[PDB]
Structure 1
Amino acid sequence: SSLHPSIPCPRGHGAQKAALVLLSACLVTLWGLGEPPEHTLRYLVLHLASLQLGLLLNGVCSLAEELRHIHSRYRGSYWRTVRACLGCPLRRGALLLLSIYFYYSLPPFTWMLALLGLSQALNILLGLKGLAPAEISAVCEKGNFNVAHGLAWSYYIGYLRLILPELQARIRTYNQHYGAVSQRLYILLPLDCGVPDNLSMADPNIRFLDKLPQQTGDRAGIKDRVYSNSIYELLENGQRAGTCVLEYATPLQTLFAMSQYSQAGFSREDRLEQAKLFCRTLEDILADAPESQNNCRLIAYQEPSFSLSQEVLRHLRQ
């Protein structure tokens, strides 16, 4: 979280520690109450069996919908749909057999089955299966089910991986042909996702000077596709203080626009979260990329009395 304090760090294992504490407390309580541990084990196994039966019923309900997509999503394989709706069928079947055995054989099975089915049907019909926001966010981060992930990887693959290697050569060409621009690309990251097309509008102290020699390449059927960069001077008290190849991170614009459109199903809180996740993912990518060797500098900032030029200079002086 060196970019900005507001960047969330990845989740740890606090839930497991709290669960261990809870387990210890529950065991202590059961010991204090002084009840037969045999009954404890019996009822715990029965509870887990009920959970397994509930999973079975919910998966059966979801199977009715998922079979409609058998040819598209699951390649015509019934076993694939079953695995998607229930997980590993072997494990689930073994657990079901064990539950049946330890219920029908321990101190009515069909009545309890009907009751559990009624409860699951109620939970489904009334829309009570929804997870809490924190669990959804954790699942999405673990599985990388985020738009920011794809946006950052697209930014790295399509632009930086094709731009950074030739940046030094282009800079040397511009410097010898013409001034002492720093040998790095400075990428701005406004967590508010406010990305204007002209920096001079955001801060007069930043002023355009010229353009580097255009880079060219063929991309996805389009040939002679050109990437261009701009040179900006940073002023202090009306006098020049630095010069750099500065630009905004274009994908953030998208995050803003997606929040304006209603067809995108994207809100402002999602916008903030995804912008910060984008910054984090891009930092993680660059920290390990061989292309990026002191060639790029990310400047992340959040507007609360704020001067962008001074922010850029605080990094340039280093």
Structure 2
Amino acid sequence: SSLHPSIPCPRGHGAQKAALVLLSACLVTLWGLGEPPEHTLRYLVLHLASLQLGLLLNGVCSLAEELRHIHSRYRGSYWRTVRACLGCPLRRGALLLLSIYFYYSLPPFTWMLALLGLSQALNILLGLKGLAPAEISAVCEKGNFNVAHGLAWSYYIGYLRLILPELQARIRTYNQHYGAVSQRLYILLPLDCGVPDNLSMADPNIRFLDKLPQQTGDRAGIKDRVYSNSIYELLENGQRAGTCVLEYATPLQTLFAMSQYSQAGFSREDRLEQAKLFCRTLEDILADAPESQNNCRLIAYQEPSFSLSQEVLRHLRQ
């Protein structure tokens, strides 16, 4: 990571390595105990069969609910619903038949089935199937089930992809028709999502200069939609030090407000996590984005004293 140390890096395969260590330790233990190795395989297969049967029971329980959404979620198809509730039906059926064959045959199946169903019903009714926070976060980042992902892609697709290509032209026009504004757009990324509408209320040194010429385009059925970029003066010890096109990242305002509305179901820990995820995703997008031909810089900072103007000037004087 390079934006800010607080930004987490993508998760690796540490869990699989721990699993391999656990497997080795368990095999060594079973070897030490000196137990009939055929029993080990027998009972492991029985345990996996129990897991498969429990998955089947929970899947039918969830199907009881998902069938009410068949015509809206699954195109009125029962096969798609069954697949959503039990994975691939062919593999699940194959493993179910293997379980049945290797339980009835290896040294009652109906009693075991009743017990597994009782356990599954107890877990479902009491809500014991809740995923751990780490598992939920891993599932969300893996499949990009996050608001920050969509916000970053909206910021790139809706604003940056349509502004950065025509940013140098407007800057050169302003320079011709008027100071030495830095030839880039600097985006502030407050991880606290404290985005004021005025940069002068954050740091007095950051003062408002003139503005770039408006950019107009037809967007989503709105004729001549306006995009305006403001130019700000950076004051050091009361004297101007540098000029640049500065602006906060607006989606952080949405992240902050969502933590203020109870209807959003968005907590403050979620706010921080999604802000950092937004920063990471935006950096990843800009890395491979062809529009960003050195036309944008991301400035992520955290408030513990702190001077925003100093960070901007550090990123400018490099």
Q: TM-score, normalised on structure 2?
A: 1.00
Q: CA deviation at 1:61?
A: 0.4
Q: CA deviation at 1:40?
A: 0.5
The C-alpha deviation readout for 1:203-244, integer Å capped at 9, x for no partner, is 110111101010000001101111000000001111110111
- The aligned residue for residue 231 of structure 2 is 231
SS of the residue 1:210 aligns to: strand
Query: Equivalents in 2 of 1:115, 1:200: separation in Å?
Result: 67
Query: Equivalents in 1 of 2:78, 2:238: separation in Å?
Result: 72
Moved over 3 A (4+): none
The C-alpha deviation readout for 1:47-100, integer Å capped at 9, x for no partner, is 000000000000010011000001000001100000000000000000000100
The C-alpha deviation readout for 1:225-275, integer Å capped at 9, x for no partner, is 110000000011111101110000000000000000000000000000000
The C-alpha deviation readout for 1:258-307, integer Å capped at 9, x for no partner, is 00000000000000000000000000000000000110010000000100
Residue identity (%): 100
CA RMSD of aligned residues (A): 0.4
The C-alpha deviation readout for 1:81-121, integer Å capped at 9, x for no partner, is 00000000000000000100000011100001000000000
Alignment of 1:156-171 (within 5 A): 156-171=156-171
Query: Equivalents in 2 of 1:179, 1:113: separation in Å?
Result: 79
Query: Equivalents in 2 of 1:150, 1:190: separation in Å?
Result: 18
Query: Equivalents in 2 of 1:207, 1:36: separation in Å?
Result: 80
The reply on whether 1:36 has 2:36 as its aligned counterpart is yes
Q: CA deviation at 1:15?
A: 0.3
Q: CA deviation at 1:162?
A: 0.2
The reply on whether 1:121 has 2:121 as its aligned counterpart is yes
Alignment of 1:28-177 (within 5 A): 28-177=28-177
The reply on whether 1:296 has 2:296 as its aligned counterpart is yes
SS of the residue 1:233 aligns to: strand
Aligned residues: 318
SS of the residue 2:257 aligns to: helix
Query: Equivalents in 1 of 2:20, 2:40: separation in Å?
Result: 18
Query: Equivalents in 2 of 1:29, 1:307: separation in Å?
Result: 58
Query: Equivalents in 2 of 1:172, 1:242: separation in Å?
Result: 17
Query: Equivalents in 2 of 1:274, 1:207: separation in Å?
Result: 30
Alignment of 1:179-198 (within 5 A): 179-198=179-198
The C-alpha deviation readout for 1:13-42, integer Å capped at 9, x for no partner, is 000000000000000000000001000000
SS of the residue 1:71 aligns to: helix
The C-alpha deviation readout for 1:189-208, integer Å capped at 9, x for no partner, is 00000000001110110111
Query: Equivalents in 2 of 1:177, 1:76: separation in Å?
Result: 62
Query: Equivalents in 2 of 1:159, 1:190: separation in Å?
Result: 19
Query: Equivalents in 2 of 1:238, 1:93: separation in Å?
Result: 75
SS of the residue 2:262 aligns to: coil
Residue ranges of structure 2 left out of the alignment (5+ in a row): none
